[PDB]
Amino acid sequence: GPGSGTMLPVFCVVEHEHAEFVLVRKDMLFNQLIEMALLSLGYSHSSAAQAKGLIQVGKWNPVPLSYVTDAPDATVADMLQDVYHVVTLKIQL
Amino acid sequence: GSGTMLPVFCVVEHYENAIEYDCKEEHAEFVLVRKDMLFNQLIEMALLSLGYSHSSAAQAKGLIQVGKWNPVPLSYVTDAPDATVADMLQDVYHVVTLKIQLH
Amino acid sequence: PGSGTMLPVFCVVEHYENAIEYDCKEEHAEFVLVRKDMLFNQLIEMALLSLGYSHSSAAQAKGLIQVGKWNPVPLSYVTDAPDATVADMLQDVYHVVTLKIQLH
Amino acid sequence: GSGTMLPVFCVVEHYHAEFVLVRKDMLFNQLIEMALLSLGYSHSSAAQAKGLIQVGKWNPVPLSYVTDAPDATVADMLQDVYHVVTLKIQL
Structure with missing residues (x-):
């Protein structure tokens, strides 16, 4: 079934x-x-490191990734x- | 059309x-x-x-969960009443x- | 339960x-x-x-099953497990x- | 807008x-x-190529079953x- 490989597709804006x-x-964190x-x-490594990112399911309010899970x-x-x-x-540089 | 109802899995x-x-x-x-329900x-x-019973709801807490994400209150989903x-x-x-908890 | 006893099925x-x-x-x-657990x-x-x-129309109906926007197919094509x-x-x-259900 | 690409799980x-x-937007x-x-x-490999597409746990079906619209x-x-x-691609 899809996703059983090594990659997952993530839609990014x-x-x-x-x-x-x-x-x-x-398998990455x-x-x-x-x-x-x-x-x-x-x-760039530094541009990627400083970006703001929120994750959104469907039409729900986007949330910080820390809201998704507490597990490091x-x-x-x-x-x-x-x-x-x-x-x-949803990524904001 | 797409129907008048939607399925919701509840625990x-x-x-x-x-x-x-x-x-x-x-x-x-x-x-x-x-x-069309709120x-x-x-x-x-x-x-x-x-x-x-109608009265069980007045002593309930509920959180909604996407996949395996942390469950969140309904109010976290949307600000629109x-x-x-x-x-x-x-x-x-x-x-x-x-996920509903009855007290 | 854990997974429930029912499953939703979308019908037209x-x-x-x-x-x-x-x-x-x-x-x-x-x-x-x-x-x-229904067959x-x-x-x-x-x-x-x-x-x-009614039982009469439920009994004589013809069905096809449709994945997304694909051509519908007879249910027989889904599986050979009786x-x-x-x-x-x-x-x-x-x-x-x-x-996709067509009544008589 | 909605992206130009679509992911397809292939083998x-x-x-x-x-x-x-x-x-x-490709055919x-x-x-x-x-x-x-x-x-x-290669491009050559596609010539004789046939596909089966599997939905969930269903029997796979020829890609041709999907649509008759060119x-x-x-x-x-x-x-x-x-x-x-x-x-699933068959060479």
Whole structure:
């Protein structure tokens, strides 16, 4: 079933607008998701590190990624395997 | 069309007192709710549909959960008092769990 | 429960509204809850019954199943397992499938 | 706007499936060729190529079962279901 591979698609909207799917490694830490998405788009290490990111399910209010889970070791797969197709990552440089 | 109803997966937790011990019971089931019902009344509608007394809702807490994310209060989902069930749940009903605790 | 005993199935029921004046091809779309452990080959009839249709029309109806916007296909194409349940076949996909039912 | 790409969970069968991004507005009848190129196969490989698409736990069905509309796009057919289907490509 989809997602059983190594990557998950995450829809990203980057403003500073540009909206686009990015493939992210499932086994990487969820708390690094914003940085990883931006690095995939060619943003510098320092630009990726300083961005503001909110995650949105469907039409719900976007929230900080820290609202999603308290576990420092949560992976992208842990949090997104079941919901990647309805989430939007809203990133502000 | 797309119908008048949307499915919502609900888990109702309530304590049942035996004699020498208590049980934290969990009853999980899908409920159909009207798309046009106000979202902030989801807890009341769910309980009614699951067969709970009207009075149980006035002693209930509820959190809504997407996938395996931390559950959050309904008020965290939207600031709009007039948001409907369809507004908030049409695109995500299959990944949400409504977790209700009866006191 | 843990997973519940019911599963939602989205149905679109087509029927001609008996009018002496003219033919109206009505489509009624609605979700219905059915037992997870019901046999998949019972789904059309039981979906109709659970939606409130009479036994007569639930018995003579013809069904197709549609993934997203794909061409609908007969239910026979879903599985060759004679004892497959509704849960077996639809647990993972009920939110993208439409049961297209044509009444007699 | 809504992105130009769509993820498709693809595998070329032999004897692991992975997501590939493909252009949404491209014809559905070009999907196999697009997926093949993204997976490291040549234009030539697409010539004889056939696809089976698997929905959840269902029997896989030939890609041809999906639509009889020559102008259907990848988005038309896959936007709503790319998270529950696997494209299996047969060379």
